[PDB]
Design a protein around this ligand. Sequence first.
Ligand code: NAG
Ligand code: NAG
Lengths: 424, 426
Amino acid sequence: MKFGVNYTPSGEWFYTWLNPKWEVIRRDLAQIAELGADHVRIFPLWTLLQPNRTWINPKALADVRRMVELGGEAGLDVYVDVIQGHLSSFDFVPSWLVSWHEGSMFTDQSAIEAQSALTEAIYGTLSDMKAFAGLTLGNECNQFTDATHPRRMPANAEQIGEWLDTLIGLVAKRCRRDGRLIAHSENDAIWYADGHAFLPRYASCKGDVTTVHSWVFNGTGQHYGPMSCESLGHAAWLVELSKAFAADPHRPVWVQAIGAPGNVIDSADAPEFCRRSIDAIADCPDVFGVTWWCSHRIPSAFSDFPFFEHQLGLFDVDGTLTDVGKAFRDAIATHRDTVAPPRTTAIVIPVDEQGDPLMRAAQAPGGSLFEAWANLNRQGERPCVITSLDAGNPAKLANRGIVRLERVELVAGHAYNAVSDPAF
Amino acid sequence: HMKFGVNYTPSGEWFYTWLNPKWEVIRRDLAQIAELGADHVRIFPLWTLLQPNRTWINPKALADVRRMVELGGEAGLDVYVDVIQGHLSSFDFVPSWLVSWHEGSMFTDQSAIEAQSALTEAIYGTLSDMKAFAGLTLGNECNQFTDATHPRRMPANAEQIGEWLDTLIGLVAKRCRRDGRLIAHSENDAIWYADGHAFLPRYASCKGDVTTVHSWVFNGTGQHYGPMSCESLGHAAWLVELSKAFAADPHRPVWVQAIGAPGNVIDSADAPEFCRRSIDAIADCPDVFGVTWWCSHRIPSAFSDFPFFEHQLGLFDVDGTLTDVGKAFRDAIATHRDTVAPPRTTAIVIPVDEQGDPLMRAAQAPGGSLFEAWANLNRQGERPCVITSLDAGNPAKLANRGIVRLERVELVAGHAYNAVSDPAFE
Ligand SMILES: CC(=O)N[C@@H]1[C@@H](O)[C@H](O)[C@@H](CO)O[C@H]1O
Ligand SMILES: CC(=O)N[C@@H]1[C@@H](O)[C@H](O)[C@@H](CO)O[C@H]1O
């Protein structure tokens, strides 16, 4: 299992992409490596990368390479997210896709070519880099197609599947030959939102690894309590849930983002949330890695962020180590060698003829399946999660080593909140 | 006398060069504009780069604007800066803190007015010590964001729009007068042609130091009357003369801040004549502050989603060579560097409410009765000006403007006006 942090540049956040202070970035990545992390995740801005649909900015590509270079010289593997897209409640969409040029990145064919050219351009610029570990198509891109988005980019579930297949397929074989990974990222709506065009099986079958972003402001922390077994184990629950919709029985699961948000978790307890959540993740088999959010706190001078976003960094505004920064550093040591035994008792999830849930609000906070797992795990049963389709096929049940099943009737939860802050 | 300049579109990477300016090319760019006979340039920083967060202005972006002003001055050109873009050639550049999850109106959101206030002062503060910094415009055609046609409209009533203009202009207005610079604001022709538009005609002609007007004959004039009609060729002069009626100062200068020969309505073979005869029409109107053509350098062929006609608007080709219109504009600078315009004596009355605004704005719009009454008067060689009904009942203002003849016409709405450059935007 791997340990890393999502890199928020100190001093100027992602606005530093306009004019990177490379000596500060070098000091930033050196601090992350000093925690014991082995990798880092970085976020270029789509508006700077591709200011026109048919012109990618060479300076922005070169600046991404420099950060990849500096990350490696600190001893860190660097994972790059291509399309931002969305970052901490803000949207950075190039001018050729807004207002007079409004379009859907998921259905507009010429916009798919632009995303296609940018993905190849990012990989081509970094192909020679030894620390270039892999690509994610973009941070939580599905938020653009959800109905909660104030400028939704429309798309049905089939178009979303073709969207993933097009971009992932461009660089999938280069990634395999080169020894790198290609993956995609979605917020918890893919697991929790009924009617969502991103289906759970997309995250667990498309791409090389399943990415998961565990945030307990989604309803789990207010419904059950900031440090309930439901909340502290939410990251583990997302790990075990995602496996049910995967075809590969030992597919790695990467918790690509997880933090202790101040809006539901208190600062005095935030270190305990870090340690125990990682204890929960460390008990699940086949975890690719744990990437914390985030590296360095957002400067106090920047505005319109949700308040809790300013304290998410592992290093404070003056560069000193945070209380959670000591918890994440100590957790890296505690779990660098811990291996997780196979999980024997599975929770059955009733699913479509094609692998999709009947009622996703039952896997959502407050739902029966959600609570059945938390209750089973709380009692030390280390449960996994299976679908109804796999439950009637002894081959897959054998490959995964399940010997005990659990049927639970579906009751919808109502605690899920699709937005970080009430203002949205 | 009147000034001649060019709107500066950076060659090679358009306004995308702001991401990483090639200063040696920009230096060569401004050298070409000066060689035409131009005395000034209008430059356009991008709001998304200037102010990536509501409470943080990027020092690198401020310094890049300063370097461009410096290169313009070392080229011998006065530099006019537009603060808020905003809108440029059918594209919107709105920062992330004013979009989607942070959607807001730049005209009514108090914190967005403070942010625009900080950027306006920062731009002026950064450039105040520089000799070639000639003045500020609040932004290129900012009214298009509040128009009812806008797909992401930032709403505002006419009273709120007045407060927006009064807040930003008043910030640097007193500094501008002692420092010897001008402060102004810009609106597209919807302020003159669109009924119900929250930007009123008297805003453009009373607020700021000079009246700005952007003359584009794809607004319906070239399609209705013909690309090389007197309605089309005199549209810029008509926009000058129309704006004066709503001005309180009888000799306030009018700045045709942008004018081009758009290829979607004018044929390339005719664009040089359109340049010459339109500037001839402007040169005959009194108190023309200047004529600023659009634009300097054509957009490179590789850039996409522009309306096709935009690629050929530049005075210099993609390889730096001068276009036929570039030779027409250069020839016009020489032809009218010394020509002064006699007073215009015959005025057209604009029926107006009790508070200075037209009864029917669509009647001065293309296809309207006031519009054609002036075009017909100008076609007959009568050199007409434009007055309001209120000024017609005040012999002092008529005396101050030297008017001796009136021409009253009934209000008939036009139906030729087009609020968008391309059919794709309807
Ligand atoms: C507009 C908004 O609230 N966006 C947030 C996003 O920043 C966050 O990464 C995600 C985590 O689940 O939750 C979304 O609601
Ligand atoms: C959406 C659109 O076409 N907007 C154009 C704008 O780009 C142009 O600068 C202006 C000139 O008057 O005319 C508007 O209609």
